[PDB]
Amino acid sequence: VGAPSSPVISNFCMYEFDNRIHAACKKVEITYTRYADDLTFSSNIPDVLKAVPSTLEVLLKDLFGSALRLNHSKTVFSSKAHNRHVTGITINNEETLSLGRDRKRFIKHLINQYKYGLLDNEDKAYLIGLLAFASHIEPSFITRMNEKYSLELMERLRG
DNA sequence: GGAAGCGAAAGTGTCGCAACCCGAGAGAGGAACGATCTCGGGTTGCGACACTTTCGCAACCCTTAATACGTTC
């Protein structure tokens, strides 16, 4: 994982895998993406995702034999009844990308601390970094923070 | 992958007990030996458990890394 060439080589080695599974999923109206070793499948049709794990095992055996295997402990089904996240990003029930309630509450906590000059420099730097990420995933959250905390405070923070 | 120490799992050998067999011996019945019962020593089968052997957890991070803050693998 630590080598600069490893990302490229790993993506290449998964090329044929991705081709086959993507095509197969598209026929049954399943969305498929891969982030390195993390595979994600989603659908609006009930009772279609149950077949996917078996399909995966067969394909892996076909392409790689016993070299690459599913982590069966890490196979998880979810729905709008439950928490859904993809690579650290929460998908809320309004179908919008979110940081999640707990992370948002934590950020608000840090901003409140800053407002009263209680954040140390390390925490301040941390807060600034996290807000940049928040701006990328959920820009509306930043707008809300501006409304809640004065634009002036927030600008002062981000300056 | 697998140090060093440790113990799980599983197979093998030991060993002490119980049940049995055998001959020896004192001497009931009544008056001639020797009935019945117990001593002492040996054998054999059984099974609980001690002993033996193998496996596998995961220290270390190899000379060889970078340093603005966050996120993901």
Side-chain angles (χ1 to χ4, degrees):
Chain A
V1 72
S5 55
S6 291
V8 174
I9 302 310
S10 60
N11 276 344
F12 166 65
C13 289
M14 288 301 291
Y15 177 86
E16 186 56 39
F17 176 91
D18 291 333
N19 226 290
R20 294 251 259 279
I21 202 74
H22 183 80
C25 283
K26 196 173 183 186
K27 293 188 284 171
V28 193
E29 300 289 78
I30 295 169
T31 302
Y32 162 79
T33 59
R34 180 174 63 78
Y35 198 95
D37 55 316
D38 162 297
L39 308 167
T40 310
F41 306 84
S42 66
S43 183
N44 285 315
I45 298 166
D47 298 295
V48 294
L49 294 177
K50 295 146 69 153
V52 170
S54 56
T55 303
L56 291 174
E57 284 180 54
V58 167
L59 186 58
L60 285 167
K61 203 179 101 167
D62 171 304
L63 292 171
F64 307 110
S66 61
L68 278 155
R69 304 187 76 100
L70 276 181
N71 204 135
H72 289 113
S73 91
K74 301 287 261 188
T75 299
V76 177
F77 289 81
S78 190
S79 75
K80 289 180 51 267
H82 316 282
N83 172 265
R84 298 172 296 155
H85 61 276
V86 177
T87 49
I89 299 172
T90 300
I91 304 168
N92 68 11
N93 292 340
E94 295 185 299
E95 310 184 4
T96 305
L97 304 180
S98 164
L99 298 159
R101 193 189 233 245
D102 290 329
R103 209 206 288 274
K104 287 185 268 208
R105 283 176 73 89
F106 180 47
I107 293 167
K108 286 190 295 177
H109 168 78
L110 291 176
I111 297 167
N112 186 267
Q113 290 291 99
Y114 173 73
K115 181 175 173 272
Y116 300 118
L118 297 171
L119 275 194
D120 67 21
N121 294 317
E122 195 184 357
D123 288 339
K124 187 178 180 171
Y126 173 72
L127 173 56
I128 291 167
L130 199 55
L131 285 170
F133 176 72
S135 82
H136 187 53
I137 304 304
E138 194 180 2
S140 61
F141 174 74
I142 303 296
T143 303
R144 287 194 297 261
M145 292 305 93
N146 288 336
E147 202 304 307
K148 185 176 159 89
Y149 288 105
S150 123
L151 187 74
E152 301 85 74
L153 180 73
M154 289 294 284
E155 284 177 315
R156 193 159 68 69
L157 177 60
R158 281 139 82 67

